[PDB]
Design a protein around this ligand. Sequence first.
Ligand SMILES: *[C@H](C)[C@H]1/C(=C/c2[nH]c(/C=C3N=C(/C=C4\NC(=O)C(CC)=C4C)C(C)=C\3CCC(=O)O)c(CCC(=O)O)c2C)NC(=O)[C@@H]1C
Ligand SMILES: *[C@H](C)[C@H]1/C(=C/c2[nH]c(/C=C3N=C(/C=C4\NC(=O)C(CC)=C4C)C(C)=C\3CCC(=O)O)c(CCC(=O)O)c2C)NC(=O)[C@@H]1C
Ligand SMILES: *[C@H](C)[C@H]1/C(=C/c2[nH]c(/C=C3N=C(/C=C4\NC(=O)C(CC)=C4C)C(C)=C\3CCC(=O)O)c(CCC(=O)O)c2C)NC(=O)[C@@H]1C
Ligand SMILES: *[C@H](C)[C@H]1/C(=C/c2[nH]c(/C=C3N=C(/C=C4\NC(=O)C(CC)=C4C)C(C)=C\3CCC(=O)O)c(CCC(=O)O)c2C)NC(=O)[C@@H]1C
Ligand SMILES: *[C@H](C)[C@H]1/C(=C/c2[nH]c(/C=C3N=C(/C=C4\NC(=O)C(CC)=C4C)C(C)=C\3CCC(=O)O)c(CCC(=O)O)c2C)NC(=O)[C@@H]1C
Lengths: 160, 160, 160, 160, 161, 161, 161, 66, 49
Amino acid sequence: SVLTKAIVNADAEARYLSPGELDRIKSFVASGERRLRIAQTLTEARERIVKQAGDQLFQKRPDVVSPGGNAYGEKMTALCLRDLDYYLRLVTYGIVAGDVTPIEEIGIIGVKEMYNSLQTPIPAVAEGVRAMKNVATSLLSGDDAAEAGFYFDYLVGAMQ
Amino acid sequence: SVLTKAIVNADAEARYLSPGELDRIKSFVASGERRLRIAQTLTEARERIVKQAGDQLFQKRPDVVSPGGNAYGEKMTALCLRDLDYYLRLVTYGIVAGDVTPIEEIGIIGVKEMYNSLQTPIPAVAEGVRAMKNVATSLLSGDDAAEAGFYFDYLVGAMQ
Amino acid sequence: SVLTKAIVNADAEARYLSPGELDRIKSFVASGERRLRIAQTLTEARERIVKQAGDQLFQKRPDVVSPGGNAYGEKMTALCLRDLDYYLRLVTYGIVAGDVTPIEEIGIIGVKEMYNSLQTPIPAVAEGVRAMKNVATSLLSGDDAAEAGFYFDYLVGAMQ
Amino acid sequence: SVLTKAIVNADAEARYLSPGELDRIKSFVASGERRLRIAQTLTEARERIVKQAGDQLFQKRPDVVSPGGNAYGEKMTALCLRDLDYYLRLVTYGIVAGDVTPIEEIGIIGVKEMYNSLQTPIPAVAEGVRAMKNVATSLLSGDDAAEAGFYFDYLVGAMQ
Amino acid sequence: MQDAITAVINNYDVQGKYLDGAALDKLKAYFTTGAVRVRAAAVISSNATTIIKEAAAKALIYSDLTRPGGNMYTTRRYAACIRDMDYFLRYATYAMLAGDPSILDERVLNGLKETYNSLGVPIAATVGGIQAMKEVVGGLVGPDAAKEASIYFDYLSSGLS
Amino acid sequence: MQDAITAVINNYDVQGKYLDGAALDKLKAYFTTGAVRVRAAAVISSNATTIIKEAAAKALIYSDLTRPGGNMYTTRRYAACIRDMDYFLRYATYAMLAGDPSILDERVLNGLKETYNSLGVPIAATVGGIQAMKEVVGGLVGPDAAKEASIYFDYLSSGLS
Amino acid sequence: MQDAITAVINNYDVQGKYLDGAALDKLKAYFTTGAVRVRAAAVISSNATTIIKEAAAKALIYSDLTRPGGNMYTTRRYAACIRDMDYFLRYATYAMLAGDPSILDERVLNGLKETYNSLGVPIAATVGGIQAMKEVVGGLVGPDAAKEASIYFDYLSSGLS
Amino acid sequence: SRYFKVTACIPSLKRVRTGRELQNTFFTKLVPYENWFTEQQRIQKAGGKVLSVKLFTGVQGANTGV
Amino acid sequence: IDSIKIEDPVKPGDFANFLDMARGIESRTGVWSISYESLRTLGPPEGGM
Ligand SMILES: *[C@H](C)[C@H]1/C(=C/c2[nH]c(/C=C3N=C(/C=C4\NC(=O)C(CC)=C4C)C(C)=C\3CCC(=O)O)c(CCC(=O)O)c2C)NC(=O)[C@@H]1C
Ligand SMILES: *[C@H](C)[C@H]1/C(=C/c2[nH]c(/C=C3N=C(/C=C4\NC(=O)C(CC)=C4C)C(C)=C\3CCC(=O)O)c(CCC(=O)O)c2C)NC(=O)[C@@H]1C
Ligand SMILES: *[C@H](C)[C@H]1/C(=C/c2[nH]c(/C=C3N=C(/C=C4\NC(=O)C(CC)=C4C)C(C)=C\3CCC(=O)O)c(CCC(=O)O)c2C)NC(=O)[C@@H]1C
Ligand SMILES: *[C@H](C)[C@H]1/C(=C/c2[nH]c(/C=C3N=C(/C=C4\NC(=O)C(CC)=C4C)C(C)=C\3CCC(=O)O)c(CCC(=O)O)c2C)NC(=O)[C@@H]1C
Ligand SMILES: *[C@H](C)[C@H]1/C(=C/c2[nH]c(/C=C3N=C(/C=C4\NC(=O)C(CC)=C4C)C(C)=C\3CCC(=O)O)c(CCC(=O)O)c2C)NC(=O)[C@@H]1C
């Protein structure tokens, strides 16, 4: 969260929270109500977002849904969608927290190593997240979509 | 090389070379003549080995030579063959050195990062090297093939 | 042993054993039968080797067997011979191991400090080991003697 | 010297000199005049001290002046005397300094290594210094001799 | 660590005995086995990543552990589990070459139970994963090698449990 | 560092050339001398202390250097000088095994001159000491090895001068 | 480091002057630009890997550098080069947010030439790679952002050369 | 005590590091005399080159005060 | 003065393998019909020049 990050920086400096750091906390608490609304919207539309994003991803990369590809077969295709759902859930948590710390601990640390064992291609995963962003953006208001975009972009950046 | 490695370990301990280390040097110089012959065989058959291995790899994995795949197109396919040729040359250097030190500096360090930028799939590359081993083994005598196999195996392990 | 040393270096690198390191193990297991024979020969002739070496050492250095000298007197002379026997036993262990690692813990680490307390002169001890080598070499076959020489030389180097 | 040592300790503490440290300096400067007299006496009698000490040392250790021994032969015997003279000069410097720091840099650091190359026995050298002390003590007044003794003792301690 | 050859030497050194024929026979036994072991070790190293993948598929993944709340849930924990698997495989290979289980006790087994208990890692599942690796390894190495390989895997599993 | 074998490999790698007959001949030349070098190295290591004593006696001590005002006056500086002698001997032995002088450049000659210049260490005497070691070694190693050993000592001396 | 806001403050502090309207106008200018810069930075971070790939394709790869005997030859060197490219991109993004080139001088530029000269890294090629990145970045960020982005890339290039 | 001023350039040839390593790579520094011999060796084993050495503090060929 | 070798059956028989040298049928879609020496100088994949 924003709070966690601020405290951690202060602890390292061994200081009480700076006026600037306090101001950042104030801004976050003001924004919180809007953030909660954005998260709720995405939660409601989750099933649709995952499904639509999956389709776009499979259109972008035929290979993943092909005999060679990892996604090939019903079970595998489901698992690939399950993963997209997991990432969407993480994004919602991120939006309410105001930071990617929640996202990062659950999903971005060790992700390369996990996917490499599975043999899933990381760039395709990133494409799926990009796809999810496009679907999500359409449902969201323009201002809301920008906020949501940052968190989606972070995921894409973290695994590419 | 064997020599380099022995000296380096001694230098770290700041000691003269151990009786065991000296023995290993003696063994290696005796082996050297045989090793040179093995390397020469592979060098002569190199054009064939690369070509045949490329064949097999593309047969094993249609995808790499497909519109989605990196290898797709003539230029790309040539580059993939060039890569195989590079790795074969490295293996020959390794056999005469008696160690993977030569191989490792030129080909195994930073390889993941290089291929990730290119977006080439690493497991396919490993398959290509496996393919090359099978071709090479057929040309080599059984005893020679075993020696050559170790060096090929190291590459496959490193590119994983 | 050869094995121990190889494993330890790999563990430090946190890697599986290199092709070259594996080859060295293969060579060592082939050598082992010959090594066992060499060790057995020395063990059988041990009593003779020690006695002859003692005599040569005392002839080479009057001082040790003189009232000033540490070796002077029956008890002291026995102890000096006992030490020579200990070093011979260590050499045999080394030959079968193919490395001085076993020898080194039992005999070469702290040796200077031990002898300095006793006030025994270190260079004389080294001479005794050289003496032992000459006797041992004569009993051994030329090829066997070379192998045995290295281990004897290591001892002489350590006590210097 | 006493002065150097006190300043160095203060500099490490990054402080001006402590009352106790200042007192030690005061005591030393009072002692200084007496110390200079003690040094002068030893300097005058130096040739005699070295000669007498040499004789005692050769009496104590016949071996050193024997064909095996390092001291054997005129040149070698001269060198052994020269060494004794060097150590006596060092002791005089130490007495006036009130500290062994001067002595230590010139004579005690690296002494073992130097003698080991030469193959001279270090314990014999120590005996020669002890011998020198006995001669020096007889020439000195009892109180003066005690002061001089400490410096002689330090030498014996440093190489032993 | 200690290997078969050194183990004999050490036992004779505490006795102070020179090496004897009986001792020589034990050493001789190791030397025959040795060539086979070297070949097995090379096989394992080349196929190491695959071995871990197969073993995870057999036991760990598609399970409650991977599902949310499970100890292998989250990428961080998944990655740590496959890292530990790799360690066990590497050390078992070292032990097989050495011909001695001691190295496993010194480097892998020491403190593992206590660490796992504090972490909350489930030991039983881990043991299951080790057993899975053994089966996969057995296939790759071939039967003669497999018997030798199996004992070290079993030694790890028993230690953990 | 590089040895004979890696020197050839590196030279071909920059061209991207597979090893050819010319290359193979150079490698063969090394392999045939190898056994001799190993024997020489063992001789030097066992006699290392003696070699340094003899070399100092012949070239450094019993002189003005060891006497007050000289650079090897004081136990501290005598000890430092024979410490340096020991490294030169050890590194020359490494070079002789390797069959390449590169290690001498990388790990002896580099920054030695600058250090020596600041200290004021007398170069001619040092070179004299290296040359003295060379003469001593030649005796011990024998005909097989003497020529080979000598070139590395010469390489060190020419680097300083 | 220094940012645009702090740069104004520092200039007034050396004068001892309280902040004045003219100073305020410079600060105000930064504040309008700021929103655009933040958007640009997010674009760059998301597309960072792509930017480097495209820029390498344009200048570095399929060249003599990649071919044997070139600085970017060998996997280790290839990887190091794309690592440096990533550094330049990241620092330029930092500078663009800051609105000041100081950070580039303080971290990237300081000691780089000397290090490069010892390594043998070719400066001209590196500069070429930076210029290539700029063009790619320009497209992604859009025109208004591109002008701001360009100056920092140019600053890096001039420093290196 | 004597002190050396030393410049060196060190490459990372075993691994590729993401964090900024420029400070490690080119490092002018002051080294106590008693530490320098070890520090020189370390730079050489890494395959760094020692660009310059000067004795900052201390007098050349001083028997005492060293 | 014997070449020896030829230990595995020299020919499986008409039915197995044979026509091994297919290489050189159409354009090098595959690997055959690409020059081994051309590799030394590949050039850019775009190859705009
Ligand atoms: C879909 C975009 C891509 C794809 C996915 C895919 N994943 C698996 C298997 C697993 N995926 C995970 C992932 C997670 N666990 C976590 O903790 C997180 C973060 C919260 C993630 C995202 C896991 C643990 C598994 C292992 C199996 C299990 O869940 O128990 C597969 C199938 C496995 C296989 O390799 O066959 C697939 C297909 N595959 C692609 O290529 C798509 C681009
Ligand atoms: C006499 C007590 C013992 C003895 C002495 C001995 N010394 C040498 C040779 C040298 N001794 C020194 C010593 C010093 N040089 C210094 O700078 C200092 C510190 C101030 C000392 C004490 C040196 C440098 C030498 C080298 C030769 C030279 O004089 O330049 C010898 C001869 C060595 C040889 O191997 O021939 C001897 C005999 N030896 C004994 O046995 C006595 C117990
Ligand atoms: C002996 C033949 C001559 C001699 C030696 C001498 N050396 C020093 C001091 C140093 N020597 C080194 C050199 C090295 N650094 C390296 O990396 C290597 C390669 C392994 C070497 C050989 C260094 C670093 C020092 C300074 C630090 C230290 O003492 O360890 C001295 C001391 C000089 C002083 O004034 O303190 C001496 C005397 N000088 C002679 O007179 C001989 C001709
Ligand atoms: C073939 C098995 C697979 C494949 C290969 C492939 N490689 C490239 C492009 C490059 N490959 C290299 C690799 C090396 N440079 C080195 O220094 C070494 C070590 C000695 C190697 C292995 C390089 C540098 C390039 C970049 C281009 C260049 O060399 O100038 C491609 C081209 C793709 C692209 O440019 O994007 C391909 C296709 N691709 C596959 O999918 C096969 C499995
Ligand atoms: C790529 C465009 C070109 C290229 C680069 C290249 N660089 C190195 C080695 C190093 N690069 C740096 C540079 C930096 N480190 C930093 O901290 C910073 C500032 C943030 C920079 C810019 C450093 C210090 C090194 C040395 C160690 C390291 O890896 O960091 C190499 C490798 C050279 C070698 O042999 O070590 C290369 C290849 N070279 C090219 O040819 C491209 C044009």
